[PDB]
Ligand binder design. Structure first.
Ligand SMILES: NS(=O)(=O)c1ccc(Cc2ccc(C(=O)NO)cc2)cc1
Ligand SMILES: [Zn+2]
Length: 255
């Protein structure tokens, strides 16, 4: 199989006698296929930055094992050559402490695996607008990736109401260093949606939020280049192309 970097893929396997699914060390969780009772699914994701050239997964059954090979593609993402160089940014201690603390808080959440669906059918978009900046835009020195846009931006004047893309539980609902006012929602099975740069937050940590319910108003918090909504999806432990993942998830779970 082939997969473009920064994308997720739904793998399908026989349910009967299945014991586990592995990638070296790492176990990969599985969930039911919602339409076919003889199948199970797993989500597999390639990082954007520095992915392997190929990946070999193994599914262990009682009777036998099944090898899955996946080749990484580069895709056709927009990229610009960086001119300066990263050097390294030297922020003041107070900011470095804040960033490092927020990072830890995020990793703990992103590696919680909720083994049931908290969603309700298909994802919807968080507002009815259009994309102003795409997933995957890269900056390169030495044709190696220095940075990339890890979500997608939708046009929004400050104050545009923003709606949950699907049901779940809120896990983050506060001002954070680069993200501004942030909401992150757990949808189950390790799928998280992300809403950044809000001017207002209307939900609370631990709250159960239904699809289409209001979660805030858009703003420009944390942003240099003007107001906009940044929407992200993290799944299989990585940031992935949100519109790509939404169309693949919906093809399977549309009620
Ligand atoms: N540790 S932290 O402060 O919570 C933290 C660090 C990095 C990021 C990634 C990120 C941020 C903003 C944007 C963006 O809006 N593009 O328009 C995209 C990605 C998110 C949160
Ligand atoms: Zn963005």
């Amino acid at each position: 199989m082939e997969l473009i970097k920064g994308q997720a893929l739904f793998l399908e396997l026989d349910k009967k006698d299945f014991l586990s699914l592995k990638n070296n060390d790492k176990n990969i969780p599985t969930f039911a296929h919602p339409k076919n009772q003889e199948k199970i699914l797993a989500i597999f994701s390639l990082p954007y930055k520095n992915p392997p050239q190929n990946t070999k997964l193994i599914a262990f059954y009682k009777d036998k094992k099944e090898e899955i090979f996946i080749k990484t593609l580069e895709g056709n993402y927009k990229s610009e050559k960086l001119q300066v160089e990263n050097k390294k940014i030297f922020p003041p201690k107070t900011i470095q402490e804040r960033i490092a603390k927020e990072l830890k808080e995020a990793n703990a959440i992103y590696s919680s695996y909720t083994p049931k669906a908290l969603f309700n059918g298909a994802f919807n978009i968080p507002l009815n607008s259009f994309i102003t900046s795409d997933f995957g835009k890269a900056r390169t020195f030495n044709e190696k990736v220095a940075s990339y846009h890890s979500g997608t931006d939708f046009r929004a004047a400050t104050g545009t109401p923003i709606y949950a893309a699907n049901s779940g539980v809120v896990k983050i609902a506060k001002d954070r260093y680069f993200a501004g006012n942030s909401v992150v929602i757990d949808h189950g099975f390790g799928i998280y949606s992300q809403y950044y740069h809000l001017s207002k937050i209307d939900v609370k940590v631990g709250q159960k939020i239904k699809k289409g319910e209001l979660i805030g108003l858009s703003g420009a918090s944390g942003r240099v280049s003007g107001p906009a909504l940044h929407f992200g999806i993290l799944a299989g432990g990585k940031q992935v192309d949100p519109l790509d993942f939404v169309s693949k998830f919906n093809a399977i779970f549309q009620l």
